Amino acid sequence: TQMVLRAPKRTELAKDGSYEKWMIEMEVGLRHRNPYASGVLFTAAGK
Amino acid sequence: TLFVSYDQNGKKLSFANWISVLSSINQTIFSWQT
Amino acid sequence: ANWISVLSPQDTPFVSMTGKESINQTIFSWQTDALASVDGNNAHVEGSRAEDGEMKPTVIKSNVTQILRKVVRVSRGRELMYQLEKKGKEIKRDLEKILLSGQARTDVLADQYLTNSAADPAVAGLNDTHAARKTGAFQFLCAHGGLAGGVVDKTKNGPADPDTGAVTVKVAQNASNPTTNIGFDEADIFDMTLQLYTAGSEADIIMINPAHAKIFAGLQENTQGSRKRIFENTKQFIYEVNSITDPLGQSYKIIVNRWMPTDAVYFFRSADWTQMVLRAPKRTELAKEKWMIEMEVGLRHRNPYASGVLFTAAGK
Amino acid sequence: KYSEEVLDELRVDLQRRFNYAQGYVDMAVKGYAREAWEYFYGNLPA
């Protein structure tokens, strides 16, 4: 599952006049139920 | 005299934007038990 | 006492006499050069055998728009609105002073404004290559004949339009004094009227700096004895002139404006001049407690040989 | 005569709309509703 903290949440930083800026606050986190439940295999042992 | 009136071409058009497209927890830390 | 006194010189006749028109780009353009010449003789011998015509189509003219900031900094009661209105009036005065100056539009682009291929490629990534947008002024668009770098030259007459020989920008020559007094000749504005009539401008307005109205005032009199006022038991001493009619039958209304350069006089016309605006005056603040204004404006002129300018000085 | 490409485009649009709606509604309502339910039984103050 993808644990999200805050959606992009369009936002601004500051204003110096015409020099506009914008910021994003995307924050998420990943979890796994059991580590020994999803398998992976690589290629190694070369040479 | 000499009225042709075939070269007005006062289009004065702007761009059209024809670009292409290729498209909750509270705390900062979270834990689970296994 | 619960009020303040403010002179607030706010004539601004030009801004209200030229109207305005919105645009959708920082650089606008029109195209109009002239009609074809007369060529005099046009006899023929029963045969055309042309050369693809001598159309020579119109030339494309453009102008740039500038920026005015007039920042507000707070560190009468609510002085905020007071200073805001004061700065608004000040920026309006500055606009009235600039649009009638002799500035000349200067920017990296001269005639290839588009350059969509290049368009200053070294701009993105650093964003600090900011140049200064400078717009075209009044004396620059009125068929000028030069410019001292960024200002129109006030000692050189303009060229002639191919349609009909007319010099809408001439160096005044006061043939009355031996080049001692800096004033319009008695027959130096009538020459401008003649040139305009030859070019067909139809202008009927003349702005003037109060440092020159004495000339037109005394013009109603003379020393030779051919022009003199009269008072038939009248309790009035009217000393003023607000209308002129050249021998060609062209009326001209005079108006005074203190925001003009003393060493120049202008021949305006309502429709021939238009005020192009892109960003309206907005009260706001910079990026992420000050206030500020930002007004993007540009100058447009229907045709250079329509309006007229005349510099006042002695030849040398 | 509904095309499958139309249905795929609709699926994509609906998926992105649901994603945005969830991302909003979560922090808009549920982040408060969970703690409100916890206070209902007095289980939040530890």
Side-chain angles (χ1 to χ4, degrees):
Chain A
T1 302
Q2 181 186 351
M3 263 185 168
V4 292
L5 193 153
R6 269 287 182 280
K9 289 288 288 185
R10 306 181 297 270
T11 181
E12 173 168 8
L13 176 58
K15 64 97 176 180
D16 294 328
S18 297
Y19 302 162
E20 305 187 15
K21 300 294 182 184
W22 291 98
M23 178 175 284
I24 52 168
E25 276 305 278
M26 172 45 61
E27 288 183 11
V28 305
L30 192 62
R31 69 177 181 175
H32 194 190
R33 207 173 298 285
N34 308 333
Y36 308 78
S38 299
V40 182
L41 73 162
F42 304 127
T43 297
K47 219 191 189 181
Chain B
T1 49
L2 185 48
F3 282 71
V4 300
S5 179
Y6 305 146
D7 45 18
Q8 284 80 27
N9 299 266
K11 67 186 77 66
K12 304 176 78 80
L13 261 56
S14 183
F15 301 169
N17 265 340
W18 294 121
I19 323 311
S20 69
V21 304
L22 185 64
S23 46
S24 197
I25 58 167
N26 302 117
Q27 285 70 11
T28 299
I29 295 91
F30 51 85
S31 63
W32 62 93
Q33 311 184 0
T34 183
Chain C
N2 222 23
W3 54 263
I4 56 173
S5 176
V6 194
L7 294 166
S8 164
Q10 293 296 67
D11 304 336
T12 52
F14 162 91
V15 184
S16 183
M17 280 293 183
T18 48
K20 31 180 180 178
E21 176 176 4
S22 299
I23 50 176
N24 305 327
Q25 203 72 17
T26 52
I27 290 165
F28 51 85
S29 301
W30 62 99
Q31 57 184 359
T32 177
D33 167 67
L35 189 51
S37 68
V38 179
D39 186 48
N41 168 34
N42 314 127
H44 275 257
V45 300
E46 310 183 346
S48 59
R49 322 304 180 276
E51 69 196 40
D52 203 80
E54 197 187 348
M55 311 194 307
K56 300 288 145 50
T58 177
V59 302
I60 311 174
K61 289 169 180 167
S62 298
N63 193 342
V64 186
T65 72
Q66 58 172 351
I67 298 167
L68 288 84
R69 195 71 59 76
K70 305 307 299 301
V71 179
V72 177
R73 162 58 200 169
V74 54
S75 185
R76 60 206 182 187
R78 277 67 182 176
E79 65 83 21
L80 183 150
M81 297 183 288
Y82 155 83
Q83 274 204 269
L84 196 69
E85 296 182 11
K86 167 173 159 182
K87 292 291 193 175
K89 291 187 191 305
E90 278 196 5
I91 183 170
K92 286 180 186 178
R93 294 190 320 166
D94 290 356
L95 184 76
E96 177 71 349
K97 175 58 147 52
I98 292 164
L99 294 186
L100 311 192
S101 61
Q103 297 173 346
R105 60 171 201 75
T106 184
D107 187 59
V108 58
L109 295 154
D111 61 6
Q112 298 270 88
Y113 48 88
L114 273 155
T115 57
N116 310 94
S117 283
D120 295 337
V123 60
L126 53 85
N127 295 115
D128 281 18
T129 188
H130 306 280
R133 293 284 178 73
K134 184 61 68 66
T135 187
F138 182 69
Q139 303 173 210
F140 178 80
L141 293 163
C142 284
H144 65 270
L147 73 171
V151 176
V152 180
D153 201 72
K154 300 164 283 183
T155 71
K156 293 160 67 181
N157 56 11
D161 52 313
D163 192 341
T164 58
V167 183
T168 307
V169 182
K170 311 180 75 176
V171 191
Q173 304 179 355
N174 182 10
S176 292
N177 274 49
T179 78
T180 55
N181 289 85
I182 300 168
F184 314 152
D185 207 325
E186 270 64 359
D188 197 0
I189 65 175
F190 296 109
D191 199 359
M192 179 61 74
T193 60
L194 262 62
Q195 298 291 2
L196 293 179
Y197 167 84
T198 51
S201 176
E202 312 196 300
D204 63 69
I205 300 175
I206 306 185
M207 301 186 65
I208 180 175
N209 182 343
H212 301 296
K214 184 208 77 57
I215 306 306
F216 290 170
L219 188 134
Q220 211 163 33
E221 296 172 8
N222 58 6
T223 295
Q224 58 188 331
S226 306
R227 307 181 288 189
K228 46 176 69 180
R229 313 179 184 275
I230 56 164
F231 315 99
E232 176 178 356
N233 290 275
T234 68
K235 302 167 178 292
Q236 305 196 31
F237 186 65
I238 302 184
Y239 192 65
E240 183 184 11
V241 190
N242 69 335
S243 314
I244 302 179
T245 60
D246 55 339
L248 308 177
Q250 303 188 137
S251 187
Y252 284 107
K253 178 177 284 294
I254 300 167
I255 61 183
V256 183
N257 169 265
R258 67 188 67 182
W259 298 123
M260 284 160 43
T262 299
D263 313 298
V265 75
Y266 302 145
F267 294 75
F268 282 93
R269 192 179 186 278
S270 83
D272 290 3
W273 283 90
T274 309
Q275 187 181 238
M276 325 314 286
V277 168
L278 198 150
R279 285 196 261 274
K282 286 285 185 184
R283 50 182 179 176
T284 183
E285 181 177 348
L286 208 59
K288 309 183 180 69
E289 312 321 327
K290 305 176 192 179
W291 282 75
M292 49 170 286
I293 294 87
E294 194 275 350
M295 185 178 185
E296 185 72 26
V297 64
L299 184 58
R300 190 178 70 167
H301 181 52
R302 166 165 148 274
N303 181 90
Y305 299 108
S307 300
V309 299
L310 184 66
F311 313 112
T312 313
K316 198 178 189 300
Chain D
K1 291 163 67 65
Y2 292 81
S3 177
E4 311 323 299
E5 190 277 331
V6 171
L7 269 46
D8 187 73
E9 179 62 17
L10 183 63
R11 276 203 301 274
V12 172
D13 181 71
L14 174 142
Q15 183 176 358
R16 62 167 56 190
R17 292 273 207 73
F18 173 83
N19 291 126
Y20 286 120
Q22 175 184 143
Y24 155 76
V25 169
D26 288 328
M27 293 184 174
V29 174
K30 302 180 178 181
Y32 308 106
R34 191 180 64 83
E35 56 190 6
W37 273 120
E38 284 186 354
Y39 277 137
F40 195 68
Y41 304 83
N43 297 128
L44 193 151

